[PDB]
Symmetry: C3
Subunit: 334 residues, 3 copies
């Protein structure tokens, strides 16, 4: 009975985001997405530690879905027969039926189609939630992503001025719980099922072994560093489906920050470090002023440097000596 135009989106793997308009003259449409669940053993660190991951579309985090307020989001969720467990999807952006979870439980070999109306603006978590103790387990195994619901007029600063980003990145942070054997090495498992008992015991102690961006230590460094140029306004969407995080751009700021992630609220300005509550997404925009390398971290520095939670930006452009200068290089003390 819903007679609106249909638009398909081709999702892209994080940290990139599929093409979209900020402000739009389009009216509501039914925006069609497909997510295909993949359970797979992956490597999560430079030492070769393995992990029984469970993913939407093969990635941790799942891809960012972008729509506008008043759109209808129609998702085909697919659980191929090559998987071992039931799965579903809960959208924090949606209203009713446990976010959609109560309507989307699918066994291996099945698919389901859910539609929800995007009545709330902001960035929001989505995650699997099959029931009971499976809920945390599927989430901390990687089954979480985000969806961004933009105002049709684009973003604003709460004082009448438009805020337009030149690019957007999606940083999904994942707390992981990898058990150790008696001598202190990380364990490997043959299936998610086999990993479950030891993983749950560790989970209940509330200390992760790894905290990573984009699924692996170092994922967003080297060839895969984030990039910008001086003068570019970059939006960084950050999600954490289970545990708090405190993002910080080393050498920069959050010029405009929605730490609770919801665009009906004005952004805060000029932040050093912001806070993503476990179970949410937030967003920060920054206009780069200086070239060079920046690190984007959670500012629990133990997590950042020792447990995996560091990304880099490589920024091109001209150095601004008015903003910062080395007046005297390192020299022997007089």
């Amino acid at each position: 009975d819903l007679k609106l135009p249909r638009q398909k989106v081709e999702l892209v793997a994080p940290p990139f985001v599929h093409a979209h308009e900020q402000a739009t003259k389009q009216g509501p449409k039914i925006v069609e997405f497909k997510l295909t669940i993949e359970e797979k053993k992956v490597v999560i660190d430079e030492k070769g530690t393995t992990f029984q991951a469970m993913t939407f579309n093969g990635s941790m985090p799942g891809p960012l879905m972008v729509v506008h307020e008043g759109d209808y989001v129609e998702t085909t969720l697919v659980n191929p027969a090559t998987n071992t467990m039931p799965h579903n999807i809960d959208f924090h952006s949606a209203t009713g039926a446990l976010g959609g979870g109560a309507l989307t439980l699918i066994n291996p070999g099945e698919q389901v189609v859910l539609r929800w109306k995007a009545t709330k603006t902001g960035v929001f978590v989505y995650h699997c939630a099959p029931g009971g103790p499976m809920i945390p387990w599927h989430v901390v195994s990687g089954m979480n992503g985000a969806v961004m619901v933009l105002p049709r007029d684009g973003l604003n600063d709460g004082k009448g001025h438009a805020l337009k980003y030149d690019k957007v990145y999606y940083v999904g942070e994942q707390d992981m719980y990898v058990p150790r054997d008696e001598k202190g090495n990380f364990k490997s498992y043959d299936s998610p099922g086999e990993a479950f008992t030891d993983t749950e015991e560790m989970m209940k102690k509330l200390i992760p072994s790894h905290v990573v961006f984009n699924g692996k230590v170092g994922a967003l460094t080297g060839k895969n560093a984030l990039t910008a140029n001086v003068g570019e306004n970059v939006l960084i969407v950050h999600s954490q489906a289970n545990r708090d995080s405190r993002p910080h751009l080393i050498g920069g700021h959050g010029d405009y920050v929605w730490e609770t992630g919801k665009f009906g609220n004005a952004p805060e300005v000029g932040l050093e470090t912001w806070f993503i509550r476990g179970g949410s997404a937030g967003a920060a925009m920054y206009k780069f002023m200086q070239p060079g390398i920046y690190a984007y971290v959670t500012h629990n520095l133990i997590e950042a440097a020792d447990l995996c939670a560091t990304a880099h930006f490589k920024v091109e452009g001209k150095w601004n000596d008015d903003l910062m200068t080395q007046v005297k290089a390192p020299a022997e003390i007089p």
Copy 2:
């Protein structure tokens, strides 16, 4: 010398709240409350784990006290001779004498009467605080509740519009520290005193064994689920006297949220998950749009599903297919 009318309140056990007006034409009064401390061994989980609780009025949390700005709150605190320890009360809503703690220390067999002027609006924690290492121990043993100080004109959205709730619930979250014996079973103790040494050792490691609403795993489920109807605006007051929490209504939102809990500040709008700082209360209101079961959790999902921190709402009314619909039920993949 204070010549105002006196009004007695009959407190009720959480999650319910004693009857009160939102907006009022009454001027200030002296509002009289009684709290009677009870130390008691209770069951906190479905496996029969026991716990040496210490409570105001027999409940965890202690009952919600509701007054208006400019009222005077006169509390008779009673420590019956059947208890073993000294106790007191600190109101975060009050000014002076460590919140009242320095004026209310009572041995078993004694009572005291404290009056404080409600000069600050919002929801606030109250808790026992007898001195030194006893302070955390009495709090994490259950000796905490909340008090709500309403504006005399009721709540507003910060943009001129009244916000009236149809009902209010009080969810008190309790971090508990139950030691285990060598083979890994929870220990039982004959008295709070006997539980103290092992409990303190565990407390200092900062990981709870249980995180519960209303004193027990499953307290706010089944016959004791929270309830609403589609179209009802429900206020949920959430407190945590010792440790952070991140509330989330699964399948809903926080339409208007005071996460720091203080009504002199405008609410934020349209939240997915909010944050209650340890040592505070916050409040969220939501107008239900869909029938069915909702879960109200802390969105550390390990705490929610595995350590006890899940409540349910059962909501009656008509399903709204515009907001959400299952377009295609689970089916075999083509």
Copy 3:
């Protein structure tokens, strides 16, 4: 080429703050500071536990630096030959080069001079960040402080009214990780280098042994209690470079709070407890209304009472019985 007047500041040890103007008619200047790194073994608790500290200017936290928006901050960082490690400095208030860290790495026997323009108002962390796993280690060893960048018109409430403080204190909170030996006693080490392996292993488990203000349990109690008088407006700057905190003034409030610490945002009003995200500074002002002793804590009460995180205020003036009174002193129950 920068032709502005130069002004030297004599830094003072926390919790005190060097003399400065709130509102000023001065235009921009180059404000000159010196920080001299000291590695030293210190006592951190009343039991005599020792700790391999690394400090700016000999203190934990490092001293508060105060300037105005648009000033240039020129810091001479000195690493004497008596130290063992390289060190640097990252200012969260600065733009570029990892906050200055990429321009300030100095070996023992060297110094460097960095200048940055104070373009962002608020309170901000500064900390050492030499690279890799050294970053958390130097920070949690004590190498962090703060800088306050005031508006030239002083502070305001966001509604047109000036907020002038009568005094300001700087409370730096430090999470410390002191390993234990087999029988459960804290270990002592002969050098920071020797402490590193055991300290890193503990750090990665994310539970501190101590959480202190001003470098030691009890530092801000007794002779060294903070002080005020009834009617005095006190600003409390609170920093935490690595881990979250939840400040609370027991018996008081946060009348005006910048919990994210940034003066381009209006303060929140009337808070009980606020939240300092790890990697940030925040600020709260309170006008004292009652004499007596107050405690200033993190409201994880286990951390406050058992791990070290309690300061006192001693406040002089006249008791206000309208705000609070003991109606009936402790007496036997009728």
